[PDB]
Amino acid sequence: WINNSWKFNSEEPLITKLILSIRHQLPKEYSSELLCPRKRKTVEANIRDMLVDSVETDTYPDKLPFKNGVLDLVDGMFYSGDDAKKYT
Amino acid sequence: WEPGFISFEDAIKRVSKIFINSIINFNDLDENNFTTVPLVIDYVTPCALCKKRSHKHPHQLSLENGAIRIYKTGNPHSCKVKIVPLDGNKLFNIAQRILDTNSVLLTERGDHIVWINNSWKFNSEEPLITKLILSIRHQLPKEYSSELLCPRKRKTVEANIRDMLVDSVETDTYPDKLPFKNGVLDLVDGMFYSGDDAKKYTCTVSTGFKFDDTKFVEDSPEMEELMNIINDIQPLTDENKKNRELYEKTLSSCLCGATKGCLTFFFGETATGKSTTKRLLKSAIGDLFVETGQTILTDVLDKGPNPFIANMHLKRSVFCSELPDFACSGSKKIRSDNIKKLTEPCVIGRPCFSNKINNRNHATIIIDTNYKPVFDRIDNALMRRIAVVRFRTHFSQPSGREAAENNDAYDKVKLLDEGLDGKIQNNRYRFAFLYLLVKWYKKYHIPIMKLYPTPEEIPDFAFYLKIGTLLVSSSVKHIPLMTDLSKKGYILYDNVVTLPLTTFQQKISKYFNSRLFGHDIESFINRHKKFANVSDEYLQYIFIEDISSP
Amino acid sequence: VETGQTILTDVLDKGPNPFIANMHLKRSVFCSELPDFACSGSKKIRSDNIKKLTEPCVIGRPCFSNKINNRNHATIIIDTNYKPVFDRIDNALMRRIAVVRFRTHFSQPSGREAAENNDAYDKVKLLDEGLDGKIQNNRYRFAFLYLLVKWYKKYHIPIMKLYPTPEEIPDFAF
Amino acid sequence: VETGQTILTDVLDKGPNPFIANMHLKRSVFCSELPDFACSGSKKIRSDNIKKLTEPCVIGRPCFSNKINNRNHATIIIDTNYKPVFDRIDNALMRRIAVVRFRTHFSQPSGREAAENNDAYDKVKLLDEGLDGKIQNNRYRFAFLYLLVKWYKKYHIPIMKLYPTPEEIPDFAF
DNA sequence: CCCCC
Numbered sequence A: 001w002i003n004n005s006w007k008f009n010s011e012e013p014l015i016t017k018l019i020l021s022i023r024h025q026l027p028k029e030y031s032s033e034l035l036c037p038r039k040r041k042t043v044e045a046n047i048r049d050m051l052v053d054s055v056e057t058d059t060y061p062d063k064l065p066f067k068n069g070v071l072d073l074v075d076g077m078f079y080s081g082d083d084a085k086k087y088t
Numbered sequence B: 001w002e003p004g005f006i007s008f009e010d011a012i013k014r015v016s017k018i019f020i021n022s023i024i025n026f027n028d029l030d031e032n033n034f035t036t037v038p039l040v041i042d043y044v045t046p047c048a049l050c051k052k053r054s055h056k057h058p059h060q061l062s063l064e065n066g067a068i069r070i071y072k073t074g075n076p077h078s079c080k081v082k083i084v085p086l087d088g089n090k091l092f093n094i095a096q097r098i099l100d101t102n103s104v105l106l107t108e109r110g111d112h113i114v115w116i117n118n119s120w121k122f123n124s125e126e127p128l129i130t131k132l133i134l135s136i137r138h139q140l141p142k143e144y145s146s147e148l149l150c151p152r153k154r155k156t157v158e159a160n161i162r163d164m165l166v167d168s169v170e171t172d173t174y175p176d177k178l179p180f181k182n183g184v185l186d187l188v189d190g191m192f193y194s195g196d197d198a199k200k201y202t203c204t205v206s207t208g209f210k211f212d213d214t215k216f217v218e219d220s221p222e223m224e225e226l227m228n229i230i231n232d233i234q235p236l237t238d239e240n241k242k243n244r245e246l247y248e249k250t251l252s253s254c255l256c257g258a259t260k261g262c263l264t265f266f267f268g269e270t271a272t273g274k275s276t277t278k279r280l281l282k283s284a285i286g287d288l289f290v291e292t293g294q295t296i297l298t299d300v301l302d303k304g305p306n307p308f309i310a311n312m313h314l315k316r317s318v319f320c321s322e323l324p325d326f327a328c329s330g331s332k333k334i335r336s337d338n339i340k341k342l343t344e345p346c347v348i349g350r351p352c353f354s355n356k357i358n359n360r361n362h363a364t365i366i367i368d369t370n371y372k373p374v375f376d377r378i379d380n381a382l383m384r385r386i387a388v389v390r391f392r393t394h395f396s397q398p399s400g401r402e403a404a405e406n407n408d409a410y411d412k413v414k415l416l417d418e419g420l421d422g423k424i425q426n427n428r429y430r431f432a433f434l435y436l437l438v439k440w441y442k443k444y445h446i447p448i449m450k451l452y453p454t455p456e457e458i459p460d461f462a463f464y465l466k467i468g469t470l471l472v473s474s475s476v477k478h479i480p481l482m483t484d485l486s487k488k489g490y491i492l493y494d495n496v497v498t499l500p501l502t503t504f505q506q507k508i509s510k511y512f513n514s515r516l517f518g519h520d521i522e523s524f525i526n527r528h529k530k531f532a533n534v535s536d537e538y539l540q541y542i543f544i545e546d547i548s549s550p
Numbered sequence C, D: 001v002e003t004g005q006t007i008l009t010d011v012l013d014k015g016p017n018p019f020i021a022n023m024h025l026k027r028s029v030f031c032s033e034l035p036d037f038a039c040s041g042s043k044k045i046r047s048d049n050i051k052k053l054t055e056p057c058v059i060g061r062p063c064f065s066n067k068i069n070n071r072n073h074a075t076i077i078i079d080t081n082y083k084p085v086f087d088r089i090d091n092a093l094m095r096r097i098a099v100v101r102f103r104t105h106f107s108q109p110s111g112r113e114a115a116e117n118n119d120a121y122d123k124v125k126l127l128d129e130g131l132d133g134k135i136q137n138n139r140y141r142f143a144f145l146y147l148l149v150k151w152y153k154k155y156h157i158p159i160m161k162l163y164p165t166p167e168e169i170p171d172f173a174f
Numbered sequence E: 001c002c003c004c005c
Helices: A015-021 A030-035 A037-050 B008-018 B090-100 B129-139 B151-164 B221-233 B241-252 B274-288 B336-340 B398-404 B418-425 B430-443 B459-470 B476-488 B501-508 B518-528 B544-548 C048-052 C109-115 C131-136 C141-154 D112-116 D131-136 D141-154
Strands: A063-065 A069-072 A078-080 B059-064 B067-072 B082-085 B104-106 B112-116 B119-122 B183-186 B191-194 B264-267 B289-291 B317-320 B346-348 B358-360 B366-369 B394-396 B413-415 B471-473 B491-493 B496-500 B541-543 C029-032 C057-059 C069-071 C076-079 D029-031 D057-059 D069-071 D076-078 D105-107 D124-126
Touching: A015 A037, A015 B151, A030 A037, A037 B151, B008 B067, B008 B082, B090 B129, B090 B151, B112 B129, B129 B151, B221 B274, B221 B430, B241 B430, B264 B274, B274 B289, B274 B317, B274 B366, B274 B418, B274 B430, B394 B398, B398 B413, B459 B471, B471 B544, B476 B491, B476 B496, B476 B544, B496 B501, B496 B541, B501 B518, B541 B544, D105 D112, D112 D124
Parallel strands: B264 B366, B289 B317, B317 B366, B394 B413, C029 C076, D029 D076, D105 D124
Antiparallel strands: A063 A069, A069 A078, B059 B067, B067 B082, B104 B112, B112 B119, B183 B191, B346 B358, B471 B541, B491 B496, C057 C069, D057 D069
């Protein structure tokens, strides 16, 4: 989930892009570890070993995804930010 | 401070750790109170600075050359100065600076493109990011510049640059531009740009050779010589006025970087300037040109892997040769579907076993041949998607000069020069030819670019053009006219004037034959004729001869 | 997504088929300028692929990949100037086609005299040379999206099911 | 470099073709052992397969390789006995062909009378059984090279070009 | 692997 969208790529998994893009969201002492690529690789290895269960994506048949947010079809309230995270 | 050192609270926690004992001014300390306020330490244990039970005086902090020095206040002979440096990953700062200079971009296809030496470059299997990283170190603070001389440091800062780029971009979006290897030439204003002024137009595919304004001039011996060559190639005669205008217009279309709607063929006999035109074009537009086989028109374009279209990507003019002459059986004809989809703005074709299906198409496809091509299918959709150039001049060696004058196809015969081939190998006519091409582009430079088909040149277009001017569909306008239509030979069914098979064929038997055109007639009949009964089968086609008559 | 008429003129499984394995999760791929069957030498449109292209699962793998199951969210619109013919017609093929006709005209002023004397069009209007470049620059992206939203509203039924229209097709006449 | 007759018997594009990708920059290559066309049963030699062997670049790729452009400095010469026959002879093929002829034979003593009285030989001599051993061990390598450079100095005009001589092909009489 | 079939 980088800048309000569920990107996924195969040749370049983006988990290191995410880790570098989430460092402003953690305690201020943590936010300087994530400037060294070796430590981001370590964090990614931990993450990858951490999540076991898989999920189902695009399970709601009536929402349009845009680059900046999901547009609800029934109501019409264009959801942005975290409120679009709920709909993968 | 300077914004690149360290987050303040990180340094504060660092000094709290170094004092190895709770500090009473932990909450009094601010950003301002730096080199004046004393720092009070309640030495519950011996001081870690000097291994004594306590200190006669507190400690004070100083900032110099990126270090926060620790020292005692007074006579610190039995004390030692400690320094903590404030350098927040020098390599991340350099990565940020290179990034903000806007020279590495992530494209929509997943390929990074870097700006080296006044031209956008990219390479899928061998990334060029570190070539740039080394190339640019001259434009950084004179302390950063020597960090990025060790290859491991360059690869670390490249890892950072490739983690910073999350958004993609779009390339080659200005069809009215011509790139080079040193700058982009603006066609609209006749002006050449370089440096940062060329960086904006993200023009990847370049002609591969530098531009020098010393050659893009109106007058030159090269100009007059190449003008004579072009005149001898396509004379400026009135009978060639349409052919010459078409040649000039179809030659400029390769410059514009958008999709083209019609195709142009260089039909012609041997030794008529076809090779000269192709090689002059190659010497002028350089790497924009590409050569590929004739399987595109003959073999299914989808098939499997096919680099013949994978290299069509962004090409602004592609030539193909050696059409497998069709008047004799043995070679698959030029496909109709293959030649219809060469005008969609994104032609479908995948590389040698790769998943990049979509390929952008700015190509003006030209193919050279000695014979009028024949289509397995001719349709209205094809009549709008074909053109042909004819050359009626000969460069002849003196040995065959006598036979040359006895040929009908050679309206003008000259002496072949062995200097043309070598001279166009060294590309002396390159820049003069670009100058005349730019002149022609300005000649037809209205904000719309469009190429129309040429149905008059093809001899295979006669019948489908003929029936348009000789046959009109039966309509309600002709219903109250069946009184005199019955005497002609038509029969009225469900308020439609139809024509039975034999009478229609014998009325056709005065316009075009049944031996040569028999396949055409039978195809038209079994594709267009309707049914009235098992006994009587007719077609709702009315000749204009009976309509015009009273 | 962009594709030609190969999907309607070949076997969809074949071997490695990235051209149909690419529509995984998409909802729009087109079929325009169909390969006219009026002459003998052009393959007709089958009835197995049409039967395949209506299920929640599609069988086919891409290049440089092994997975064969893609989720069908796709809508396809076919268009050609003629009425296509099919090699095989039965009950199954009935529910998998809908057809709409337009008879609207625009052409350059030099072709107006030949424009007004033909029965292939229903109304006489002139050609606009600016709309092509305007839609080339997405001048109608958000607006047409607004229109699409309004049209989704006009049929926003809790259940949505596409339907066929066999009465337009002349193959189904008999 | 040497190669088979697959150059003159099929299409060089197809799939991978190292028989054509290995011609890159070589200055001499031949093709022999032709499928004689006096008896039907083989596809006639492609006439384009002469046109593609004249353009300063040829098309073909190695196995598992991407590059498609190929450089062509080569001299290609055909060595056979029977007059060639082409599927379609036009203005393209006539200038891309010239015939050189051998009017000498060398024979073993056993069959001396057979060749000595043949209308295709203006001379018959003995066959040497020592040339092959000497020539395989590069005896005349530098002597032959010197003779070749002298011949080059014979015709080193500003542009090396070869003139076709169509007077020998019997198919061009019509 | 692409190729082969």
